[PDB]
Symmetry: C5
Subunit: 311 residues, 5 copies
């Protein structure tokens, strides 16, 4: 079979639409998500036209094999989509209405800069390669673009599913390619991070600061070192749920900065002891008293500065 012939030198417009049924498995480490949707295609093939009076029927159904169907592919998919044809319906003028149900593992990159308070735009790129007979251009039939109400992405809030109506037409290996951008806008459900990582991490830090109300070096060393190890465990736990980024993430910055607070606490604890031993407990008292205000104030201001830079 060959593509439909042009009335003039115009390209063939394949109207598209994606309707999400199930949306799942957003892997932050892999920057992938799995989708299960309907793909609808519509184009005019004058060769398929018929008189409804003479033929009796208003529409004719065909098996994929019988007629010409445009080779539509997804750009950012991992492996080729699993698709099963639901229906192919031809109207008297020759307008074909194709429908298939597919599933694919889509590879769309993520911006972890504001993690876990981040919002993402997932992409689904539809593409078509022009044949030698005629050039093929994609379009968006907005009435056939949507999502089911039940569509839930675990740990995420689905904001919108829209399509950038004007395709990206470009040359590739000396043939026209018409690319379409379907955008799924989502925002992370940060709630869990608060009682599981953020608040536990702040509690262990504040426990390290109880060393500023203690003259016992042995007890201080235990307080600051033990809590530093729990902070290492939280740093490791966090960096496992995330990929290696060439930029600093919000949680990454807080986690990093907190190491400096532990390092300075060890220095203060060491200075206090050295001074007490050197028979200068009055000077050690001044430093310890100052640290009680300095540490919370510098922590609070540094955090205001960070939140400002990141948001």
């Amino acid at each position: 079979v060959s593509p439909p012939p042009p009335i003039a030198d115009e390209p063939l417009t394949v109207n598209t639409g994606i309707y999400l049924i199930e949306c799942y498995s957003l892997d932050d480490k892999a920057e992938t998500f799995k989708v299960n949707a309907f793909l609808s295609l519509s184009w005019k093939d004058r060769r398929l036209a018929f008189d409804p009076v003479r033929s009796g029927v208003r529409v004719k159904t065909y098996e994929p094999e019988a007629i010409w169907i445009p080779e539509i592919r997804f750009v950012n998919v991992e492996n080729a989509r699993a698709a099963d044809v639901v229906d192919i319906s031809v109207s008297p003028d020759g307008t074909v209405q194709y429908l298939e149900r597919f599933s694919a593992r889509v590879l769309s990159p993520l911006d972890f800069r504001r993690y876990p308070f981040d919002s993402q735009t997932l992409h689904i790129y539809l593409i078509v390669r022009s044949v030698d007979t005629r050039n093929i251009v994609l379009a968006v039939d907005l009435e056939k673009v949507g999502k089911n109400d039940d569509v839930f992405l675990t740990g995420w809030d689905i904001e919108s599913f829209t399509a950038v109506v004007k395709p990206a037409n470009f040359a590739l290996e000396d043939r026209l390619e018409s690319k379409l951008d379907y955008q799924l806008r989502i925002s992370r459900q940060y709630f869990s991070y608060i009682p599981n990582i953020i608040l536990p991490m702040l509690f262990i830090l504040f426990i390290s600061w109880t060393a500023f109300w203690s003259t016992s070096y042995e007890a201080n060393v235990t307080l600051v070192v033990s809590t530093l190890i729990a902070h290492i465990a939280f740093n490791i736990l966090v960096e496992t749920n995330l990929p290696k980024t060439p930029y600093m993430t919000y949680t990454g910055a807080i986690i990093f900065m907190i190491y400096l607070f532990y390092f300075v606490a060890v220095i203060e604890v060491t200075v206090q002891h050295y001074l007490k031993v050197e028979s200068q407990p009055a000077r050690a008292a001044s430093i310890t008293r100052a640290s009680r205000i300095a540490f919370p104030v510098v922590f609070l201001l540094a955090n205001i500065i960070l939140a400002f830079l990141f948001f």
Copy 2:
């Protein structure tokens, strides 16, 4: 092939039934479960009618390819079900009796609010898209809906497997869709959580309270900090077996609240030491004596309040 023709303007009724053989792999993190069942379908196709006298055979067997079979799909499956046709039997009036055995990874959401004392309703949604010739409606043949006695879901108790007999008939992309709801009611086997997480977690908390019967700051710091770290390990262990929820789970709440008890224990331990050093051991004694009653009482009441709010 085309769908059966109507006697009048009636829709075509496809009678359904699911009989679970094997039920397994309930992933709490993924909110998926795997199923291995029988799918039975039955509809009348007058075109397949035959005389048993002339044909020799009461029933005729056909290969799926030979006749028209309704395109029945599952809504909430991950990938398309793996199915193998067991039998297709046609009676002289044209009544088709389809049987297939399938396996699928079903995606049904879970409510972790009362975890690990939670009960779930897993869903299996059957659907059918109406063709242009005639509208297709699903039905439940209750005699062909059930589960095997051997059906075991590891770490869960299977309560019931029933079907909501009235289908959800709705419009989708300008065609009628007939959806059916099969519900598998299950309840978690919480027993293992008690000797593995709950009791170990309470033992480490009570060990931290032995600091209220000790004047040794160095020993108290070790007691409260060491047990706090074991609590962090239990928090990490628990949050690995669960997905990130936008709500507080029962175990999540207890785990969180216990951090506050560790934080207040560190404050008491610090106050006691400061006072002893400041040569006020009488005042430190009053606080320590009070804490011995306060901590268990406040822990017990807070837990009564939590159990009340959650159950």
Copy 3:
């Protein structure tokens, strides 16, 4: 094709046999094992009968497509078995001898009560659905049931592979079903558990008891708390290699009970210190001296009681 016709109203007997080639991947958490075996089937089809004198040949070979083959399925498999036909041989009387090589992930439940000193009976269930023409019954050809000498299941000892010769004949969805039970009896190789979990766990417990020969509260607190944390690590490591059971496992019981010993050791250590501080070291001495005998004796008796209840 249709099933063989009966001489009288007798059912069709399909003689079966499974011969294990490779047995592997026993997942304790999933309660699954992978198998790679031969499946032999034998039944009489008089339509296939031939005279060896006239035909010249003693046996005739056929492709599966050419003749009727009973639809034999496995009940407790995860997905449908991967099978490849080795041979189909027909004798002059019409006796068909089918052979196929298959692989499947079998889902047979396990009893962890005596873990890691447990023995299991893995099951492979063969089933057949009766057709409308005639009822099909399964049988065991014991000469075609066995296992290869090389068959090794890592971390397990394979005791026997036998079949319960009388099939379970029952009604299902208004048709007769003939189920057969193939039993693979295995017993766990507990040896590794001794130097890796049991002995390390006992050593850390005995180290905690060196606190009964020490008057240093700070040292005792360190001894009992540090070793309690190592016991938590062993509890976590053990519960990862096992699924969540609604019953107590042998190792689970020992692990749980050892927590009580740590809890009572903390109480003794606390009492000794309180008494020493209260200027009653004589009474603290009596308690410490008693604990030296009490702890090992109660540990040894409690273990005799547990081993008795479990074995």
Copy 4:
């Protein structure tokens, strides 16, 4: 199609050869490895013979479907090999030359007794089932057995790839089977184990022995207990990279024995303290002084004995 007819009563010899292209994924826990190789088969079928003068051609190419091909299977594979036919070439005498490229996950057991200083013999078993017409026997064409120079198995050294030329001819399910043994001899690259596990483990042990130059019980308890926990982490890390064996591995033995050294160090530390408190520091001094020599000497001799027993 039927097998080639015999000139006399001789069996049909299928000459074989395996040429490894890619060798990868050696799973120690699973005792599997993945292979990607060429399988070459050669047998004489007189029915395919032709005159090169009359036919013009020197060799004839055939599609697998066109001619009889022996059903060659792998014994110790997990699932059936993925194979794609490269070429089928017939010479004038009827000698068929088959070539296919395959990939399979091979299940060959491993001997961890000398781990990580172990050497293995991986096996690839080729087999063929005799048909009723005539018996089929395998052979090794040594010119068609080899491996690519690039063949690399990560963390292993590939020593040799040879075949045991005489097949194992035996009865199975009342038919003759001809098995062939292809052996891949490999040896572990132990280098990484030295700076990552062995030396770190020895350093922590030697740190525990600094307690023999200290009179501080509180410091000794910390030294011996802390280092014992790091040893537990190394034991856990090691037993994760390995399966549960019914025998003692070399690293397993060293790891186990080191626990005894920690246990005796705790006893010495306890004895020294008891004696110092009992006002017998002279006797405690003798024991501590002796331990300084005893511990390294007994450690060094015990290791000589172990290396001797294992190698």
Copy 5:
């Protein structure tokens, strides 16, 4: 179908080109990467030639089945590539222009010597086996070799994608093979390693050196031992993200060397205490004062030497 006939004794040139669409999943442990690309092939088949005047058309399209297509395989792939034909176009002279879109898991080894400051050259090897009719040689059509601008490999920077234009022509199993080398040059994004592993690891080391400004043995033992354990956790974390190499990696060397610094710190701490107890605090003071300069200086020089040897 047979291969194209030669004009003379020349070999058949198959012009190739790979255009990367999606590049993903670089597994450091497995030394694999997944690719999703276009594979373009071009060769002349005079049998397919036509007159554009007489035929009307300028190019003719064919289904793969209709014409002869060279059997092109990938050498270093894990399993056979998943490919789907985009287009086959024949020009009047008989020049065939094949295009397919494929996906494969490529196995190309990595050099971890400079990790995480390493650069890699990933390889994609195209190969072709000569048939008996005529020898087949590969070529690189540079206009059909490239990569998409969007091509992103998580945690890596893609430098170049080029092809070594001269094929490696060699004999294999008595037939000519033409191999082509496609090279993807990438360099690791080391940024994340600095705040997550390197700086945390240096902070814990510097904390251990605060023991040179402390006379408290109990406190020093805690400081050096606690920080040594955190270093063990970082060593474990690092060796999990990497395979077992028969050489020393850059991070491996630093991590190893840091153990020696901990070991010497324990010796100093032990010597200081022994001397203080032996009533020689003046000599212990000299050693402690020297260590304050020695440790940072030796650490800094040793690191200069390592960076020099590795870069």
